[PDB]
Symmetry: none
Subunit: 257 residues, 4 copies
């Protein structure tokens, strides 16, 4: 219980620190702020909990057997390009796991000052408001998040062609944690990418699970924090439609990758 309180406090403080850094005005910046903020999160975690492991975008973590003890998986800036170009629409993602099992997840939209957070088996929240469980949708009646940049790619362009076609429309926001959360809130019916690192899904994942969401990789396998993977989330009915209807006919090509 104190763990959760400590982490929320941390992520908020991480927030203040990023906004402080964005002056500055009084591309090198993004990577500095990324390094500075991860050092801060990693340093604060060890200062109260030196038995915990931090798996970080900035090169903290390191073969960490992610199955043992308490593990923080953090991206102080999920949405690097948004940050450089829009100065907004990025998030700190933190997911906390214990004994290889998810415990809490936070994704915090720094500039909008919205924190999405969830504890396992206790519901998902936008600030103080509960998120409602997702309902099944039909793909044709569904909005999917997917970056236009993935359709340009050699193979893969072909494998996503159908799913973009039948879906109702498509969006792309450029921060994987927030898109994952967007599904949790029902603002997208599905989101997918061929490659994501665990620090960009660990937070989002736990939140989605609380609203009855559904996570896999493009081949239907479970997602774990042991490595990068492809992404297909969520909403039972429609995850089931995308995978195996549009996806298992490309089972072969996916596996080269």
């Amino acid at each position: 219980m104190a763990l959760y309180g400590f982490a929320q406090g941390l992520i908020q403080e991480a927030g203040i620190r990023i906004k402080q850094l964005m002056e500055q005005n009084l591309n090198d910046l993004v990577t500095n702020v990324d390094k500075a903020t991860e050092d801060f999160i990693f340093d604060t975690i060890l200062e109260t909990y030196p038995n915990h492991q931090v798996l970080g975008e900035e090169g903290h973590g390191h073969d960490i057997d992610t199955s043992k003890g308490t593990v923080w998986v953090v991206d102080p800036i999920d949405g690097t390009l948004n940050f450089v170009h829009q100065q907004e629409n990025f998030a700190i993602s933190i997911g906390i796991y214990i004994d290889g099992k998810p415990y809490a997840g936070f994704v915090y939209d720094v500039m909008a000052d919205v924190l999405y957070h969830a504890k396992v088996g206790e519901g998902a929240y936008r600030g103080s408001q509960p998120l409602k469980p997702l309902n099944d949708s039909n793909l044709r009646q569904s909005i999917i998040g997917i970056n236009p940049n993935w359709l340009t790619k050699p193979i893969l362009g072909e494998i996503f062609k159908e799913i973009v076609n039948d879906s109702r429309s498509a969006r792309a926001y450029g921060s994987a944690a927030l898109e994952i959360v967007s599904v949790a809130t029902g603002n997208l019916e599905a989101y997918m990418t061929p490659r994501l690192q665990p620090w960009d899904f660990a937070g989002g994942l736990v939140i989605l699970y609380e609203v009855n969401g559904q996570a896999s990789n493009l081949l239907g396998e479970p997602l774990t924090i042991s490595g990068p993977n492809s992404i297909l989330v969520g909403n039972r009915g429609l995850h089931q439609e995308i995978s195996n209807d549009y996806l298992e006919p490309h089972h072969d090509a996916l596996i080269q990758l």
Copy 2:
């Protein structure tokens, strides 16, 4: 001088509250149809009253066959981004452009849920609320972020042209309200935005805002946008605009013209 601009400004704002009343009421997707219709009727009726001499070109079936070149013309989309409205209950905008004698005069795009109004008058600056907007600077495609629905890279002939540009861009986004995507360029939030098909009521408001920040608009053939009919759209900071149109679009002028004639009539 400012009377009409002032009037449009307050009208769109009121239209915003009413849309939110209608959403708030619903609990007490036929909803989107009804709210679209109710919003346009409100907007239409209110113009009719102060300005019986104007014409309304509307998304919802007002002004179907009118001559946009004659007199003053409000070109309105009560809900630009219907899909976002149904699914996300946000990220949609009332869009209004006003033209006189065929030429741009004033634009408004109102992000209803943010309560944020972007607006401009020709020659007079663009605005976010009452904050002036600030002119754009050139960006290179290679260091640019561009709005373009994924769907379009899926189409015959068009899809291939679009992915040279996507390939080459720094990355791509898509938000689902043309009018907001245009403002995003107006804003520096996006460096360019493209689509092969948009209606006048969807670029008319945003276009005036974009031009006031020294931005640039054209169809995919590089021809000026007018309200006389639907079109393709390229908007961006100047050149970047030049770059897309000139290295990526122009070498397919003939194919794109074919596409343009196959689409419009």
Copy 3:
């Protein structure tokens, strides 16, 4: 029907941008405010008159001092309510506009120029802070109420004694230097009441409509209705404490008060 309401809303926002434009271009503090005030009224007045040449304008700066205010559409405007604030703080001042049709309230607007916040309502249609509806007021006891009243009124012959009780008794007091915003403070629930012995139509006309929409109550200090006929005293609050201040704090000074 919202046509005129819309026109007013846009106009007040536009008048606001012009105010800030005049302020930013100082590339004398009393001269600035006097210029801005004139130019600003002129600007509202011109714009009303070219869509509505039959409407009348009652302005702080001297438009319509000759008029019957109870005939047709009458706009009652103060381009800078809070002039001292404008000079001394460059903020906390409002454009106030109230519209009347045939002597009855129609729409009110107060626009806090520097905060970019516009309070507005049309009779029967609710009050709003931007796009946000204001909640209806609840009654409060005076002992638990914060009231707005300038300290200056306490220093004055006859006046000091008549307000003494009301300030001793209420929970605490505030003063902001703009009657139109203070009336809006009562409508938003930031103050429970506000009072002043003297004020012009252009300063309460906007606020009054906003406040009437949240079910507040306005009179002069003698409990008489408030018109745009001319200057009057003001007491505004939620119903209950307006009833409390009027009845057992203000009526015992009925005599007196009546000057003038």
Copy 4:
């Protein structure tokens, strides 16, 4: 400068916790009460956890009995403006002043709902967010706007003294957060501010800021304000501070001494 940033970060984090607690309640003088306790406890615990040899003097009872001239002392008010918090849900401020060996060092007051942080380190100027504040110019009382709660004008003897100066001034305002009001003097929004009673937690932050833009502060008897006790307050730009003190207050020295003793002895 590490202690300065630490304090800057902490005060802001404190604001997040207050807003968070406010937001929850939308799902009760008891609100202000719990929030006051919670925020001070957060502030206090965070200070001691990094600097255990420091001391905290606090509105909520931390450090009752403290030699404020010894070592590093934080003087904090989590909600300056409890009435405004209860009634307006805004116009309140966290106030932190930091002193080392009884000398001022740093002052923070943070308008939580406006997200505007007023700060100053000693000898480094005052700031509203990241904009520097200009030194104050002298003004006459006649061309001045002073801050003063209407309630003081009705107090036996004090009323008559204050009436003289309100009457004479251009006009009066009253905002109901002394910390914010002191800062209003620092930004030139009010030429002057006065009140017969304040606690150190409410002026300690303000004073540093005021001091950086050249204002001066004293109590109603012209004595200097320290953090060792509550006091009455007069702050303003130099000129009219001298004018109000020497012309309107001073001729009632004896009356004011009596009031001061009645209120603050022993």
